């Protein structure tokens, strides 16, 4: 039996990795992800210059998941590039970097710097088009003309296969429109579905007060809230973008959810809120739980069921 | 304490009503809603001609809520108009009708027929701009040009105060753009936030099959999944549309969720999934639970705390 995944020119020991933003901001974070049983890892969504992010409190754990408005705290693109070029142990597992420049001009500058490091080390880019927690910066993926510009300019500047972190869509017409844009960019080799369900609001009934400080309490939702949305997006793009991979992100707490993501079409499975809750030991648990389901169903590889969800 | 709501010249006993679609399709359904302890009720979103809706199975109750793709099964506009004109007991409570024509032309033809009945009986219109379960009909509310056309044509054709059932938004820019359109239409006196989180996907791990038949398993999500989204939408439009009321819909199972909706800005509070699960006896419980919270907090009326959620 094998959890192995062969994509983007690498063997991954298993399909599991962190969701961008979780356990991946500092060198220590990235060390712990590398030492974990995860198949891969991804660096915190970064900007050209460092950021400290939004004021506190900006994260609140919930019974059904999480709400956050972190505000893209990151050590700046040079930190993550240097991590990728010098620090990361590629013999352990491949490395992704998430990049979230807050303009096309910023993104172009950042990805340009990545080119030599991708060529030398094999570092993979996930372009973030969906951060919902930066004041005054709308989610790029909800504007298809803006999305087209980003993909055009990053395709030109970077010139190598890369992936995109998409916001969740909730409308068939939007799946169609998103896919039409994505399918015009052959360098987009993977689509990560999904980022947080944006701009939710949690209120404490006792003190009648919102639970996070930024944006009048409005924050991105993760965890159990998002699983059906995440599965839908995965499957919608799996079908609409057959020349691309899909990575699943959203609501994974166990082997069962991972199994569903993969059945829906996911090549890799990212873990955010649950990883925030449980720490990197979760990857060992997820590997075991997924294998148990496969054992019970008589599956020996992921390929026996990836993208084989049945309809009526 | 008093649960009363006084809007559009009517006295409502309490803020509670069914969400459009739940317990409101047939005469018997509407009788049961009228006989319940609810403050009001709304008829099933109707079309000019009857519809049988989508094939089966099209509804699935979930641990955390519901997924459906009913497909606007309805007895046609004449049935609901005739209910509103002849059958409904207005001494029990006021009546809303939801209308969901699948074209602006259809919606116009429908609302014109309602005009005499509103004038005579006080029947209130909720225009549905958000149904996510009709194949080939995207949610109007996610296209601001189309939304503007509907509001223009319905305002002109109906010529009386009405409300709109909006899809959930997940982006600050969309709140702004939606509000800008709504604020150009003075006859829009209330905004119901929110309709289902559109186009989620639930998969059964045992048989590796989606749980509903229409649209390859894609259906609207209700229940615990939607509470933070609903609260966010309620509060965003409460602040952006001061000339209008906001009605809350989404994730209400208890007086506590009702209290949060009202604290966020809601005038009426609609109950979908929980009502589908428990039956109309739920309304007796919700009144009791909200009364308890107000008593504990020393709130004499809903007006003392409506829209007074605290931020940091
Ligand atoms: C604390 C924290 C921080 C971030 C996030 C989440 C959380 C919880 N998310 C969203 C994340 O990548 C993921 O898409 C969602 O959390 C959904 O997955 P889960 O349901 O949480 O597993 C996120 N996404 C991204 O692309 N870049 C980022 O920097 C962040 N930051
Ligand atoms: C079976 C069923 C049928 C419908 C719905 C839901 C369900 C469960 N919903 C959506 C509903 O009005 C409501 O917006 C959502 O269900 C969210 O509220 P809850 O979280 O379920 O209370 C719905 N909404 C609407 O405006 N017109 C309709 O005809 C229907 N039909
Ligand atoms: O960094 S994001 O979570 O705001
Ligand atoms: O009628 S709606 O529930 O699809």
Distance CA B227, CA B125 (A): 24
Lookup result for tokens 């609409």: A240
What 8-state DSSP symbol labels residue B27? H
Here the tokens at position A255 are 């082997």
DSSP for A71-99 reads ---B--HHHHHHIIIII--TTT--EEEEE
Inspect the interface and report whether the beta carbons of B64 and A224 lie closer than 8 Å: yes
Q: Indicate the domain borders of chain B.
A: 1-53+72-196+223-312, 54-71+197-222
Specify the pairing of strand B245-249 against strand B266-271: parallel
Tell me if A128 is assigned to a ligand binding site: yes
Q: Between the CA of residue A33 and those of A38, A146, A249, what are the distances in Å? A: 7, 33, 17
Spatial CB neighbours of B294, under 8 Å, sequence gap ≥ 6: B1, B3, B259, B300, B302
Distance CA B115, CA A140 (A): 42
- The gap between the terminal CA atoms of chain A, to the nearest Å, is 30
Residue B241 known to be catalytic: no
Inspect the interface and report whether the beta carbons of B311 and A264 lie closer than 8 Å: no
Specify the pairing of strand B188-193 against strand B162-165: parallel
Tell me if A82 is assigned to a ligand binding site: no
Q: Which residues does chain A have within 8 Å of residue B216's beta carbon, measured at their own beta carbons?
A: 235, 311
Looking at B46, B131, B193, B241, which residue is catalytic?
B131
Q: What is the resolution of this structure in A?
A: 1.8
Lookup result for tokens 């601001």: B144
Burial of A5 (0-12, 13-18, 19+ CB in 10 A): buried
Lookup result for tokens 């939004």: A54
Assess contact for A246 and A265: CB atoms under 8 A.
yes
Distance CA B201, CA A234 (A): 10
Here the tokens at position A67 are 């709400």
DSSP for A257-292 reads HHHHHHHHT-SSEEE-HHHHHH-TTHHHHHHHHHHH
Instruction: Tell which A residues from 167 to 186 touch B, by Cβ distance under 8 Å.
Output: 167-175
Q: Which residues does chain B have within 8 Å of residue A273's beta carbon, measured at their own beta carbons?
A: none
Inspect the interface and report whether the beta carbons of B218 and A236 lie closer than 8 Å: yes
Distance CA A171, CA B137 (A): 10
Distance CA A111, CA A157 (A): 7
Assess contact for A199 and B227: CB atoms under 8 A.
no
Q: Between the CA of residue A158 and those of A129, A162, A167, what are the distances in Å? A: 16, 9, 22
Among B247, B283, B282, B241, residue whose Cα is nearest residue B262: B247
Among A192, A191, A171, residue whose Cα is nearest residue A241: A191
Q: Given B175, B198, B213, which is nearest A170 (Cβ)?
A: B198
Q: Is B272 in the pocket of ligand 4 (CB under 6 A)?
A: no
For residue B101, how far is its CA from the centre of ligand 2 (angstroms)? 16
> Angle between the A144-158 and A172-182 helix axes, to the nearest 10 degrees?
20
Q: Whose CA is nearest to atom 1 of ligand 3?
A: A72
Burial code of A132-142, b = ≥16 C-beta within 10 A, e = fewer? bbbeeebbbbb
For chain B, how are helix, strand and coil distributed in percent, rounded to 5?
A: 40, 25, 40
Atom number of ligand 1 nearest to Cα A224? 20
Give the residue from B228, B234, B256 with the most A CB atoms within 10 Å of its CB, the best one to mutate: B228
Q: Is A70 in the pocket of ligand 3 (CB under 6 A)?
A: yes
Instruction: Provide the 3-class DSSP secondary structure of residue A57.
Output: coil
Among A68, A77, A88, A17, residue whose Cα is nearest residue A48: A77
Among B29, B12, B161, B19, residue whose Cα is nearest residue B93: B12
What 8-state DSSP symbol labels residue B223? E
Identify how the structure was determined.
X-ray
Distance CA A20, CA A192 (A): 10
Among B204, B129, B119, B224, residue whose Cα is nearest residue B169: B129
Instruction: Tell which A residues from 40 to 69 touch B, by Cβ distance under 8 Å.
Output: 57, 64, 67
Tell me if B20 is assigned to a ligand binding site: yes
Distance CA A233, CA A20 (A): 18
Inspect the interface and report whether the beta carbons of A232 and B199 lie closer than 8 Å: yes
How are strands ordered across the β-sheet holding A16-18? A16-18, A269-271, A245-249, A188-193, A162-165, A124-128, A95-99, A41-46
Among A143, A85, A155, residue whose Cα is nearest residue A114: A85
Alpha helices (H) in chain B, listed in sequence order: 27-35, 77-82, 104-121, 144-158, 172-182, 227-240, 255-264, 273-278, 282-297
Lookup result for tokens 């702004």: B176
Spatial CB neighbours of B165, under 8 Å, sequence gap ≥ 6: B20, B45, B98, B126, B127, B128, B129, B130, B192, B195, B249
DSSP for B296-307 reads HHT--SGGGTTT
Assess contact for B144 and B80: CB atoms under 8 A.
no
* One fold for B1-53+72-196+223-312 and B54-71+197-222: no
Which residue does chain B place closest to A67, by CA atoms?
B228
Please compute Rg for chain B using Cα positions: 18
Quick one: CA dihedral A255, A260, A266, A270, positive or negative? negative
Tell me if A45 is assigned to a ligand binding site: yes
- Distance between B297 CA and the closest CA of chain A, angstroms: 9
Instruction: Provide the 3-class DSSP secondary structure of residue B308.
Output: coil
Burial code of B241-279, b = ≥16 C-beta within 10 A, e = fewer? beebbbbbbbbbbbbebbbbbbbbbbbbbbbbbbbbeee
Atom number of ligand 2 nearest to Cα B130? 26
DSSP for A14-34 reads SSEEEPTTSS-SSHHHHHHHH
Distance CA B139, CA B121 (A): 31
- Distance between B207 CA and the closest CA of chain A, angstroms: 8
Domain B54-71+197-222 coded CATH 3.40.640.10:
no
Distance CA B271, CA B273 (A): 7
Count each helix (H run) and each strand (E run) in chain B, helices first: 9, 16
Spatial CB neighbours of B25, under 8 Å, sequence gap ≥ 6: B44, B73, B74, B75
Distance CA B150, CA B155 (A): 8
Assess contact for B85 and B121: CB atoms under 8 A.
yes
Please compute Rg for chain A using Cα positions: 18
Here the tokens at position A249 are 């992100």
CATH fourth-level superfamily of B1-53+72-196+223-312: Aldolase class I (3.20.20.70)
Q: Given B202, B256, B309, which is nearest A210 (Cβ)?
A: B309
Which backbone phi and psi does A65 adopt, to 5 degrees? 155, -125
């Amino acid at each position: 039996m094998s959890l192995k995944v062969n994509i983007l020119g690498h063997e991954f020991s298993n399909p599991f990795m962190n969701a961008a933003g979780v356990l991946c901001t500092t060198e220590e974070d990235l060390r712990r992800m590398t030492e974990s049983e995860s198949g891969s890892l991804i660096g915190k969504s970064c900007t050209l210059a460092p950021r400290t992010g939004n004021p506190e409190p900006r994260y609140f754990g919930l019974p059904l998941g999480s709400i956050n408005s972190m505000g893209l705290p990151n050590l700046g693109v040079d930190f993550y590039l240097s991590y990728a070029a010098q620090t990361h142990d590629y013999s352990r597992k491949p490395l992704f970097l998430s990049m979230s420049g807050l303009s096309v001009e910023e993104s172009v500058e950042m990805v340009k710097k990545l080119v030599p490091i991708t060529k030398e080390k094999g570092t993979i880019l996930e372009l973030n088009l969906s951060c919902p927690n930066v004041p005054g910066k709308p989610q790029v993926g909800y504007d298809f003309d803006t999305t087209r510009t980003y993909l055009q300019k990053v395709s030109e500047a970077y010139g190598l296969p890369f992936g995109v972190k998409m916001p969740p869509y909730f409308d068939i017409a939007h799946f169609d429109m998103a896919a039409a844009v994505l399918n015009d960019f052959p360098l987009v080799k993977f689509i990560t579905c999904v980022n947080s369900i944006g701009n939710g609001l949690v209120i404490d009934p006792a003190n009648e007060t919102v639970v996070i400080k930024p944006k009048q309490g409005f924050g991105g939702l993760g965890g159990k809230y998002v699983l059906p949305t995440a599965l839908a997006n995965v499957n919608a793009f799996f079908r609409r973008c057959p020349d691309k991979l899909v990575f699943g992100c959203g609501g994974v707490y166990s082997g069962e959810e991972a199994f569903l993501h993969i059945l829906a079409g996911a090549s890799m499975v990212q873990v955010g809120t649950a990883l925030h809750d449980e720490g990197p030991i979760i990857f060992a648990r997820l590997n075991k739980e997924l294998q148990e389901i496969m054992t019970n169903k008589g599956y020996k590889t992921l390929d026996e069921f990836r993208g084989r969800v049945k309809t009526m």
